[PDB]
Amino acid sequence: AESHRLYVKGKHISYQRSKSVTNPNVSLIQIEGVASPKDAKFYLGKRIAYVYRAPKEIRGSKIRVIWGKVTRTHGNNGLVRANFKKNLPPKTFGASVRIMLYPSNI
Amino acid sequence: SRLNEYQVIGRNLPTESVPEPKLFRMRIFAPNTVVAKSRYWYFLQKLHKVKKASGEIVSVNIISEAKPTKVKTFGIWLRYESRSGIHNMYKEYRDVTRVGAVETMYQDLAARHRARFRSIHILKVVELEKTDDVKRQYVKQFLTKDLKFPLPHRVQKSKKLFQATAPTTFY
Amino acid sequence: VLKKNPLKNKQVLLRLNPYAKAYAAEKVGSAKVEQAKVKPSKGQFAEVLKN
Amino acid sequence: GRDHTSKQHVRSGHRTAPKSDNVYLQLLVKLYSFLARRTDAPFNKVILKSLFLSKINRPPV
Amino acid sequence: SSFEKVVVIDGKGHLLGRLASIVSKQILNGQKVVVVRCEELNISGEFFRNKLKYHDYLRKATRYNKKKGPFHFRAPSRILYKAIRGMIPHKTARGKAALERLKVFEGVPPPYDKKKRVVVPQALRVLRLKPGRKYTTVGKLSSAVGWKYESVVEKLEEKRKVQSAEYYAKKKALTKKLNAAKASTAESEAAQKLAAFGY
Amino acid sequence: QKEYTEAERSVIKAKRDAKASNSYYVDAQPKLVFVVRIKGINKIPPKPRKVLQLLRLTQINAGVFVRLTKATSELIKLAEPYVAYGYPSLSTIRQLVYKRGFGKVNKQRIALSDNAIIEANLGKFNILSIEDLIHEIYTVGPNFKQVSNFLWPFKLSNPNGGFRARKFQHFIQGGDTGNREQFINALVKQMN
Amino acid sequence: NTLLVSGPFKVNGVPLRRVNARYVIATSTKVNVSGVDVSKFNVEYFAREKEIKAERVADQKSVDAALLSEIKKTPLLKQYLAASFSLKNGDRPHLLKF
RNA sequence: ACCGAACGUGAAGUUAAAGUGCCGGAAUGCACGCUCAUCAGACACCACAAAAGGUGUUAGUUCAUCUAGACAGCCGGCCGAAUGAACUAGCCCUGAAAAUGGAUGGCGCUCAAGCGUGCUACUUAUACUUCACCGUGAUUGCUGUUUUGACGCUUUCACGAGUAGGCAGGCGUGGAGGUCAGUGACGAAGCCUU
RNA sequence: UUGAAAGGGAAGGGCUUGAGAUCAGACUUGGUACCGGGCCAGCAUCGGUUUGGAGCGGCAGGAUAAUGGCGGAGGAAUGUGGCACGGCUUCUGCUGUGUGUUAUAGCCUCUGACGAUACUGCCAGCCUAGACCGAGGACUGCGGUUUUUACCUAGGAUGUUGGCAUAAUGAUCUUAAGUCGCCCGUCUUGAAACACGGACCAAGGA
Ligand SMILES: [Mg+2]
Ligand SMILES: [Mg+2]
Ligand SMILES: [Mg+2]
Ligand SMILES: [Mg+2]
Ligand SMILES: [Mg+2]
Ligand SMILES: [Mg+2]
Ligand SMILES: [Mg+2]
Ligand SMILES: [Mg+2]
Ligand SMILES: [Mg+2]
Ligand SMILES: [Mg+2]
Ligand SMILES: [Mg+2]
Ligand SMILES: [Mg+2]
Ligand SMILES: [Mg+2]
Ligand SMILES: [Mg+2]
Ligand SMILES: [Mg+2]
Ligand SMILES: [Mg+2]
Ligand SMILES: [Mg+2]
Ligand SMILES: [Mg+2]
Ligand SMILES: [Mg+2]
Ligand SMILES: [Mg+2]
Ligand SMILES: [Mg+2]
Ligand SMILES: [Mg+2]
Ligand SMILES: [Mg+2]
Ligand SMILES: [Mg+2]
Ligand SMILES: [Mg+2]
Ligand SMILES: [Mg+2]
Ligand SMILES: [Mg+2]
Ligand SMILES: [Mg+2]
Ligand SMILES: [Mg+2]
Ligand SMILES: [Mg+2]
Ligand SMILES: [Mg+2]
Ligand SMILES: [Mg+2]
């Protein structure tokens, strides 16, 4: 009862980019404990939440969310590409996201 | 490269003068049959008044290893070009396949003489049946009786970036 | 207005090629061949092994 | 990119209408646009093209 | 692969640039890293060779005003810090925050003397260098180029190791007693079931 | 389908018979080739540029079927540094025509989505179906010219899996240009 | 296209309700529900018309009776059903069997 | 100015040339060797180095001595098993000296993150594939239902870089003929303004 | 001046999102507790494009794979047992050297009848994970199933549920962050140039 987590910990690592040009429409996400594309393919299609705090209350809450989804793997070390409704702000590079266990296929 | 051994057989195009020209065979170590037929014409025009335009490829067949799980020693006779001249050499390799010995040879002359694939002619690959046929010590040292050796300083590959225990190299 | 691939859409495949139905029904893609157990290389074609 | 074997976006180089703003010549072009579009007679297509021609291309007969 | 609150790396026996690149990517990706015992780090190549390299570094200074030029830090932690900062986009705000995520020390000062130190196998000298190659200890290179506190660190390190040995002897004794109690409670119904479950 | 299977079995039988009778069966030289332009449109000398235009290869990844004769072989030799070509199998031809098959109808690129389109343009040549068209291409037929020119040049994608490390050197030397001869099928599987 | 679900309510506090199949992890543990009558339950049962209906409370009790009767047979199954699920530190759902 | 590729506004996929230790997206990837530099080396154009040398190390070529005991060492013996010479070419080293401090791009790298070679995956251009939208050019049809827009509506396909320059279609200003029986002291024109 | 904001050796710009401010909009000119609608989403099924799986099955080819296993014949050594000499062993994997050819281990070559697998192809074979898109707008066509002048996956997205309408949503402005961005005009082969004109603004100006 000390733990209540139903999501996998993730991190916003980068945008999709070449050496000099970045593409904000695709985010690179590191899912915790995933080290290969085979592991990362479990999470394809899963929802992602970026939860953050804001100055103004909206309906009595100062907590806002940007929703996204895992679309494909990236590279060979288990990072995935994510697609959020609104692009994650660049300040969130290194910020933690939540990888939801739904849509479930277990 | 990753190679196969091919039997390529070819001939001059028949003429009304000569209606059955002589058939010539070559053993070619090539990655595929396109390079096998290219190397065939490459050596035939070094050895005969023939061209691909005036010739004909008769047969291309893979030659599989006779005993692919028997450990052998091969002697390979080579003719390679250096930056200054052309040299003949003879080297020895230990392997279970003739192709894998030729692959090791190509890596070895790339490493020791900077000799590229284009600069090498394989004159001959022979399996050395007798232990007395082995001239080179770097392969003769593995033909001694009751050969044992350890592998000191084992390095274990980790799946994680951080390890909570001290590294070890026993083995 | 929209091209449909006959290699994915079975209806378009039958529209273009009516014989695909017979090919599937007759299993032409996995048809066995009846032949004798022979090996014609035992003699001089062993010229491949050495020459 | 494309390796163009001909010049791109080239107008036909033929008149598709009279340069004239005479409404009655436009009515004649209407009548023979309908005839050329619907009669299969080559005469009507020739007449329709000739109604577009300029003054020097219609010398007095 | 877990996200940790702080990763404390024991810097002994680690190759400088390989540890630097790994730590750089860690702090860029939002991980807080502490490196202790930077005086025990290693650089490949003989000591004289690395000392000559540091003197090449010392040669470089702003001609018109030496106070503007590169600032050659002599402490081992600062040598590691220079290696990391060279691998960080330190002139951006993001790189500055990433560098705020990092701490480097000589010795093992509090509070890290009573915490867990890990190693990084991809950067360990004993696992990376061919067993005959020569290497340098950054503590000796630092003393050879101006670092003043080598003997203070080793005096404090001997005191810390004596205290940590008293710790370990107590922990081992309580581990022996707990193991004897787990042996006593073995072959019980719960133990047999946990053995059938793999525990 | 029956004649395809019979021809395959006949060639296999001929090879086995030549093997048995101490002889060597020499295959008939290929009569058809599929040519893919793998080079861009910049910096091409005038003669190979004209040759690629006459082969209707005016963009990268454009493919065309060519019936091999002396004239067409000497054409393809000029364009060799810019193309990858080879001998296409029946399944490769079928996949190309089914997925990316378009006809030139009144100088317009029309999808081959119904046999009436093929009949209205090639019915005077006894081509009434997509399978008739595929057969005419595969077994290089008496109306190969009309059937292959009716086919608009195939516009392939880039390979799924990439090329070799460096395209613009002959396939024999580890590149991509020139004649690869049966590996055109693997390349087309990658690009179509 | 929804799943009918019970806690059972006595064990869990989760009543008879619908869930979506995509917001569910289907474990490998199973209970014999051949003795549970779920004939009267359908979409119109959960129609939108706080106070809970006496029909719904009665159906909850009747279903939970059979569910508990079958649950008692498997040891620790009632405790398992009454305990919440959470991801612990070092739990990898791509490696775990459920 | 080289390599790749040439450009309407977008979505998705894949690539080219170049890369994948960090700066930087992608491997501290798999593999066979070579190299240790008290000025290592590190990728075409290209931003340098030669002749000549080295018992550094590696691999070769050709001669010669060898269990009828080779070379070395103690006085033929003594352990026993290889040895000598010339030559070839890989990497490394010497040859190798300039002026502000400083550049394989930087950090840094030594069974490499260097050099030669092979393989697998992976990264991503305004390029290629499919689709949407804009425009240009061509193209299908439209009058007994043409029907107050035919200089219009509509079907289909292809294409889109641009200085000098040409042409086309439009935006805006002062004044003039006509028209809106137009706006306006109940506020024209002008001016300021997320 | 007041107010707002930002500010480590310039500032300014583009793209993107966050934050704050401003503006907008369907319960419509909604119709009679209900009908139905708008927007944002979840799920299902479809169609177009596409990336995958430690996927599963069938067929073909080759030296009708080469091997391997089994059988036969021959042979050798880095010679097993045995034997004969030895140095250390209460002969305690004892061991070394000779001999010779399976013995108390085995191996190599040729070969005979079977049986597989690798590799490369084919399947108009099967199962399975995800992403982006939904142009069009009565019917007309081509096909398929026909139980049928009917139905379909077949000439381009529908069904259902939830929430919201003081708002989830969108735009702009300011600002931060990431990334890229040299000063325009000109003559010139070549300009950011250590080439020239330009401090600023209005009106005039070919
Ligand atoms: Mg274009
Ligand atoms: Mg890929
Ligand atoms: Mg490449
Ligand atoms: Mg070139
Ligand atoms: Mg990276
Ligand atoms: Mg020299
Ligand atoms: Mg040398
Ligand atoms: Mg040098
Ligand atoms: Mg560089
Ligand atoms: Mg390499
Ligand atoms: Mg793209
Ligand atoms: Mg233009
Ligand atoms: Mg102009
Ligand atoms: Mg005036
Ligand atoms: Mg008035
Ligand atoms: Mg006013
Ligand atoms: Mg200042
Ligand atoms: Mg903004
Ligand atoms: Mg906002
Ligand atoms: Mg689909
Ligand atoms: Mg056999
Ligand atoms: Mg629509
Ligand atoms: Mg910049
Ligand atoms: Mg000027
Ligand atoms: Mg001038
Ligand atoms: Mg000048
Ligand atoms: Mg200028
Ligand atoms: Mg200048
Ligand atoms: Mg001047
Ligand atoms: Mg002047
Ligand atoms: Mg001035
Ligand atoms: Mg003015």
XYZ file of C-alpha atoms in Angstrom, chain F residues 35-148:
114
model
C 16.103 -1.344 -65.407
C 15.842 0.998 -62.394
C 17.376 4.474 -62.443
C 19.071 4.905 -59.063
C 20.864 8.187 -59.866
C 19.527 11.723 -59.594
C 18.983 14.201 -62.414
C 22.020 16.449 -61.882
C 25.411 16.325 -63.616
C 24.753 13.761 -66.358
C 26.791 13.829 -69.591
C 24.756 14.401 -72.765
C 24.886 10.894 -74.234
C 23.802 8.899 -71.140
C 21.303 11.684 -70.414
C 19.716 11.180 -73.836
C 19.870 7.404 -73.341
C 18.042 7.600 -70.011
C 15.437 9.845 -71.613
C 14.943 7.324 -74.413
C 14.551 4.625 -71.768
C 11.951 6.866 -70.067
C 14.043 6.980 -66.891
C 13.668 10.667 -66.097
C 13.574 10.472 -62.306
C 15.271 8.514 -59.578
C 13.761 5.090 -58.788
C 12.013 4.838 -62.162
C 11.794 1.320 -63.570
C 11.147 0.020 -67.070
C 11.080 -3.326 -68.876
C 13.505 -3.737 -71.784
C 13.684 -6.571 -74.308
C 17.335 -7.507 -74.733
C 18.814 -7.229 -78.219
C 22.116 -5.838 -79.499
C 20.579 -2.377 -79.871
C 19.004 -2.281 -76.414
C 22.067 -3.840 -74.770
C 24.278 -1.133 -76.256
C 21.742 1.424 -75.032
C 21.850 0.075 -71.474
C 25.657 -0.031 -71.460
C 25.736 3.754 -71.851
C 23.354 4.249 -68.921
C 25.088 1.634 -66.755
C 26.703 4.013 -64.180
C 23.243 5.407 -63.355
C 21.030 2.308 -63.304
C 20.645 -1.006 -61.531
C 19.136 -3.699 -63.718
C 18.638 -7.417 -63.858
C 16.518 -10.349 -64.893
C 13.042 -10.146 -63.326
C 11.090 -13.149 -62.163
C 7.432 -13.754 -62.888
C 6.328 -12.949 -59.340
C 8.318 -9.706 -59.429
C 6.646 -8.708 -62.697
C 3.248 -9.608 -61.270
C 3.775 -7.584 -58.093
C 4.997 -4.584 -60.086
C 2.038 -4.647 -62.464
C -0.519 -5.269 -59.706
C 0.642 -2.637 -57.240
C 2.205 0.070 -59.427
C 0.794 -0.706 -62.866
C -0.356 2.291 -64.839
C -1.141 2.689 -68.517
C -0.459 5.548 -70.912
C -3.938 6.501 -72.129
C -4.120 9.673 -74.227
C -0.797 10.741 -72.703
C -2.236 10.372 -69.190
C -1.168 8.019 -66.396
C -4.187 5.809 -65.641
C -4.259 3.116 -62.965
C -4.729 -0.442 -64.219
C -7.671 -1.067 -61.915
C -9.954 -2.854 -64.386
C -9.473 -5.134 -67.382
C -11.607 -2.811 -69.532
C -8.838 -0.197 -69.395
C -6.343 -2.750 -70.696
C -8.744 -4.019 -73.349
C -9.624 -0.584 -74.722
C -5.938 0.192 -75.299
C -4.377 -3.203 -76.104
C -7.326 -5.212 -77.398
C -6.126 -4.920 -80.987
C -2.978 -6.758 -79.815
C -4.935 -9.595 -78.150
C -4.208 -8.348 -74.629
C -7.478 -8.586 -72.720
C -6.375 -8.842 -69.098
C -3.747 -7.891 -66.581
C -2.575 -11.494 -66.803
C -2.332 -11.210 -70.587
C -0.201 -8.104 -70.078
C 1.975 -9.851 -67.480
C 2.385 -12.869 -69.764
C 3.324 -10.653 -72.704
C 6.017 -8.996 -70.599
C 7.329 -12.187 -69.009
C 7.482 -14.373 -72.108
C 8.777 -11.583 -74.315
C 5.981 -11.611 -76.839
C 5.298 -10.435 -80.378
C 3.646 -7.286 -78.997
C 6.196 -6.595 -76.296
C 6.851 -3.123 -77.695
C 3.240 -2.002 -77.466
C 2.605 -3.629 -74.084
C 5.724 -2.231 -72.427
